[PDB]
Amino acid sequence: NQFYSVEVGDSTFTVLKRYQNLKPIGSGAQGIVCAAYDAVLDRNVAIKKLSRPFQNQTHAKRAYRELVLMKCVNHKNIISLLNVFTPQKTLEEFQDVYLVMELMDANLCQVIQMELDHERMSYLLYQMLCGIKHLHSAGIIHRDLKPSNIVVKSDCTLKILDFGLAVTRYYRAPEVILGMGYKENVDIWSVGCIMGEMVRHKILFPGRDYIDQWNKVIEQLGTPCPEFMKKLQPTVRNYVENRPKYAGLTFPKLFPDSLFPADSEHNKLKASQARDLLSKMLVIDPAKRISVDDALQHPYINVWYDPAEVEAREHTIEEWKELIYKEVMN
Numbered sequence: 001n002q003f004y005s006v007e008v009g010d011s012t013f014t015v016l017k018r019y020q021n022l023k024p025i026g027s028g029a030q031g032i033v034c035a036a037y038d039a040v041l042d043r044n045v046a047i048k049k050l051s052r053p054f055q056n057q058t059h060a061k062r063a064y065r066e067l068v069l070m071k072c073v074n075h076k077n078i079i080s081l082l083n084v085f086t087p088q089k090t091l092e093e094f095q096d097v098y099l100v101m102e103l104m105d106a107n108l109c110q111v112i113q114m115e116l117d118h119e120r121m122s123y124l125l126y127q128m129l130c131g132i133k134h135l136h137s138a139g140i141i142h143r144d145l146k147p148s149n150i151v152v153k154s155d156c157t158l159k160i161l162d163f164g165l166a167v168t169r170y171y172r173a174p175e176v177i178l179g180m181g182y183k184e185n186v187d188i189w190s191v192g193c194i195m196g197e198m199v200r201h202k203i204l205f206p207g208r209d210y211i212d213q214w215n216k217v218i219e220q221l222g223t224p225c226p227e228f229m230k231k232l233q234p235t236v237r238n239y240v241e242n243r244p245k246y247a248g249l250t251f252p253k254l255f256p257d258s259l260f261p262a263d264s265e266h267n268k269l270k271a272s273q274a275r276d277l278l279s280k281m282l283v284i285d286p287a288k289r290i291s292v293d294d295a296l297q298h299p300y301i302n303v304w305y306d307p308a309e310v311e312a313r314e315h316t317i318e319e320w321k322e323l324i325y326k327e328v329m330n
């Protein structure tokens with residue numbers, strides 16, 4: 001037959017013959033993801049499997065949009081879709097989608113673990129921004145960026161895996177958390193958290209439930225200003241003012257020098273520049289937050305700036321199932 005079946009944990013991966021020697025590498029919201037060798041292209045790939053996405057309105061939209069978007073966006077810092085296929089032969093039996101992306105070497109989350117120097121770090125954030133820029137120019141604002149969905153290669157290149165919204169909430173910008181409208185730089189917020197996390201190694205803004213999310217933010221950055229507050233909904237604004245007030249710490253408090261290299265004037269100045277960048281991304285009020293182009297130009301990041309890289313309705317389950325299937329036959 002054209003396909004065969006390998007058992008991967010609770011999953012049975014039923015795949016085209018071209019894809020050899022499957023090994024599990026990780027697991028997100030859509031399910032398990034395997035690395036695989038691809039005899040046709042003689043190179044390694046990733047196979048994400050989507051089980052029955054049509055049977056939930058959200059997964060259904062994430063899946064449709066992402067097929068569509070995947071062949072519709074082409075940027076070196078956005079993961080590329082190599083192939084899609086289902087092993088089922090009619091709509092009626094259709095059930096699983098298999099997506100073949102390109103493959104890297106690690107998760108952003110692991111790379112946050114290493115004691116990074118400014119070279120490696122500025123260059124990763126440069127790429128993140130280039131990629132977000134490319135998604136923005138496209139008409140896509142991600143709103144749900146997080147490190148586990150970003151992957152890297154030994155040579156330190158970097159791909160975003162997904163397209164956000166249009167569990168872990170630690171990186172959602174405040175405008176999102178509070179549902180209050182947003183512009184492009186809602187994505188800058190998350191770059192903030194990931195940048196802090198690279199420095200602090202702890203998650204910036206942990207917090208158990210959503211209410212406790214907020215409270216770790218203001219604890220550190222301080223309560224937002226009133227012209228912010230006036231923008232919430234009548235009811236919604238009341239809920240939030242009902243906390244203790246905070247001044248929030250300065251950014252050399254939040255990110256002391258012990259955390260950066262300090263032997264050299266070079267290292268002292270770079271640290272300074274990082275803190276400034278952070279100081280401008282991690283700004284609760286978007287109206288005052290740095291935006292994407294200005295961040296690429298920022299001294300911490302621009303030793304990398306390359307204009308070549310920088311520039312470039314609802315349904316029923318049934319209807320979703322068809323739309324998704326139809327899209328898999330291309």
Ligand SMILES: COC(=O)c1c(-c2ccccc2)c2cc(Br)ccc2c(=O)n1Cc1ccc(NC(=O)CCC(=O)O)cc1
Nearest residue numbers: 023025026027028033035046048101103104105106107151
């Ligand atoms: C931890 O996994 C990762 O970070 C990862 C994920 C990933 C998986 C699930 C959830 C989030 C992201 C990924 C997803 C898509 Br779609 C496309 C590419 C990647 C990727 O390149 N890596 C790096 C990677 C590439 C290869 C390996 N290692 C192996 O392939 C092991 C092979 C073996 O053991 O023989 C590990 C990570």
